[PDB]
Point group: D2
Chain length 193, copies 4
C-alpha cells in the first residue's frame, strides 16, 4: 500500500495539471507576451521566490542565461534569492522583509519584469519585492496558488497572475515548474522561431 | 495558437506523468524504503545534481531539513551543489569533475545515501560522486531519464534507479520534482504516521 | 586626499593585525587543537555566519573540502549559510531565527565542532545555532569582535572564543579571514606535516 | 611552537599589508573613481571570482546592495558566482569556461564595470568574463596577485589592475578583502559624504 500512496500522489498531480490546462493558458499567454516584450525592449527579468519557489526562480534564470532547449544567445534573467552573503547580511541587520526589495531597488529599471513565485503569495519579503518593483515601473508576472494571497492584491492592469488551481503546496510547486517550462518554450519559439 | 503550444506543453506533461505512474511505483517504493532505512540508522542523505537537477536536489534537502508538510524534527539531508565557494575553488584548481566527489569523500559515512539526480545520467561530476559514494559504502538512489546514462551503469543490487520514461529534459525535470515530493510523503508517513 | 583615506584604511588594518598578533595566539592555538582533535576523531566541522561572516565560513569550508595549500585528502567541513533554498524555506515559514539551528539539529553529531563567525556575536540565528550545538554535545569555536556579544556568553570550558580586538566590523572581518587562514595552516601542518 | 607558526602567519600578513600600502594607493584610487563614475552614470557593477575570490566578490556585492557602514540607498552590484543552478547548468552542458561570460553577455551594458578577482589571474572562466565585458564596452577593475596572469594581459587604457604584491594566495585573498573594504569606504565617502 506504499504503491497506493504513490498512486494517490501521482493521481492528485495529474488532476491538478488537467485543471491547470483548462484554467491557465490565457494567463500563461499574457505572461509570455509580457516577458517577450520586456526582453525585446532590451530589459531584463528579476526573479524571486522562497524555498522551492526559489528553486523554481533559479530554474527560470538558468533557462534564460544558459538555455532552455535551443542553442541561442544568453538572455538576461537574475534570481534575487541566490547570493547568500547578500541575503544573510540583510537578515543580520534586522531587515528580513527587505532582502529582495533592496535588490529590486538597486537593480530594477523601468520596463523590467519581476517574476514573483509564491505558493500562498503571503510572505512579506515577496510582497515588498513586488511593491518596490511597481515603484520602479516594472511589470509583475506572479506565479501563485491558493487564493493568490497579498500578492494578487498588488497586481495592476499591466501585471499578470498565473494562479495554479490548487490548495496544495507540493502540487502548486510542480505546476510552477511546468508553467516556467511552458514560458521558456514560448519565449524561445517567439524570439527564435 | 500560443494557446495551442501551451496545450501541447501541458499535454506532453500529462502523458509523461501517466506513463510514470504506470512504470515507477515499484522503484519509488524501493527508494523510499532505502531513504527511510538509512535515516532510521542515524545516517544522512547527500544529494547532488546539475542545473535544474541541482534545484531538485535542494528541494529535497529543504523538505528534509525544514519540512515537507507535517511539523516534525529536521532530518539530515545535504545538497552538494550549493556552496559556490567550494564548487568554484575546485573548478579554479582544474578539477571540475571532482566538485561533488571531494564532498562525498570528505563527508560520506557507510550507510548514508547519495541521491543523484540527472536527466541523462552522463555528466562526469555526477558519475564520480556516485563512484566515490560506492567506495564509501553508501547506497545510491538515482533519479534519471533517457536510458539512464553512465549513471545507471554504476548501480549495484542494493541501489535504486528511478528512470522517468521520457527523452525530454523539461518533462524529466518536472517528473523529478514530483518523484521527490512522493518520496517526502512516504518518508514522513513512515517515520511520523 | 583620496590617497590619505586609503592610507588611513590600510593603517587601521595594520594596527588591528598588530594588536591581534599580541592578543590572540593562545586562543588560535586552542581553537586549532580543538579542530584538529575533532577531525582526528572522525568528526566534522559545521560553520555558520551572516553576511561577510558567511563568506568567511565558506572560505573555511572550501579550505577543508578542497585545499588550503598542500594537496591532501578532502576534510569534512560544511557551511550552513549556503543552501538558499533551505534558508529561504525556513524564512518563508516564519522561523528566521532557526535557519542554522535546524541544520545543526539535523546534522550535528557529538564531537563535531560548530565554527560560529560573527562581528558582534548578537544575531539570534547564530546564538541559536550555538545553543543547538551545545545541546548536541558539539564544541564551539567562535570568531567574534567588539565584546563578543550574546555568543561569548554561551561558551563553556571546552569552547574557544577568538575575539578580534576591534570595534570595527570591516577590520574584524579582515582579521577573521586571516584567523581562518592561520587555522588552515595549523590544521594542515598538524595532520599532514 | 604553535604560537610561533601563528606569529609567522600574522607577520607575513603585516609585511604584505605594509608593502601594499606603499604600492597600491594610486591603483585603488583609480579603481574607486571608475566604480564611482559608473555608478553615477546609472550603471552597475558585475563581480566575479572563484573560490575565496568568489567570497570576496560577494562581500563587495553585499556592501553595495545592503550597506558597508552608513545607512544609504542600495547600490547595484551583482556577483556572477552565486547562482549554483546557472553555474552547474553551464557546466552540465560542457561549457565550464563560459559560466561567467554568458552572464556578462546577457546582463552587461556599456558603461558597467566588471570587478574581476583572481589570485593568479589565470583561470579561463575569469579571462573570458573579462573578454566578454570588453566586448560589451564595460570597464574592468581587476584584483590580482603574483604577476597578474592572463588577466593583466587583457586590460586597456581605461581599465585598472590592483595587483597585490605577494606570491602567496592566502595573503593575496586577505589583501583583496581589505582592498574591497577601502573601495566601499571611498565609494560611500564620495557618493554620500
Ligand atoms: Cl555527518
Ligand atoms: Cl541591468
Amino acid at each position: 500500500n506504499v504503491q497506493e500512496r504513490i498512486k494517490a500522489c501521482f493521481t492528485e498531480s495529474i488532476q491538478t495539471q488537467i485543471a491547470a490546462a483548462e484554467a491557465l493558458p490565457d494567463a500563461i499567454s499574457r505572461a509570455a507576451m509580457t516577458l517577450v516584450q520586456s526582453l525585446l525592449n532590451g530589459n531584463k527579468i528579476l526573479c524571486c521566490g522562497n524555498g522551492t519557489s526559489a528553486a523554481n526562480a533559479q530554474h527560470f534564470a538558468a533557462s534564460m542565461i544558459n538555455r532552455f532547449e535551443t542553442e541561442r544567445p544568453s538572455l538576461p534573467a537574475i534570481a534575487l534569492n541566490t547570493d547568500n552573503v547578500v541575503l544573510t547580511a540583510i537578515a543580520n541587520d534586522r531587515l528580513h522583509d527587505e532582502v529582495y526589495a533592496k535588490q529590486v531597488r538597486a537593480l530594477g529599471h523601468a520596463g523590467d519584469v519581476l517574476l514573483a513565485i509564491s505558493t500562498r503569495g503571503n510572505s512579506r519579503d515577496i510582497v515588498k519585492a513586488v511593491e518596490a518593483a511597481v515603484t520602479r515601473d516594472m511589470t509583475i508576472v506572479a506565479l501563485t496558488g491558493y487564493d493568490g494571497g497579498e500578492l494578487a492584491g498588488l497586481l495592476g492592469p499591466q501585471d499578470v497572475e498565473i494562479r495554479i488551481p490548487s490548495h496544495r503546496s507540493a502540487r502548486i510547486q510542480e505546476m510552477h515548474m511546468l508553467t516556467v517550462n511552458c514560458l521558456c518554450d514560448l519565449i524561445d519559439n517567439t524570439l527564435f522561431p
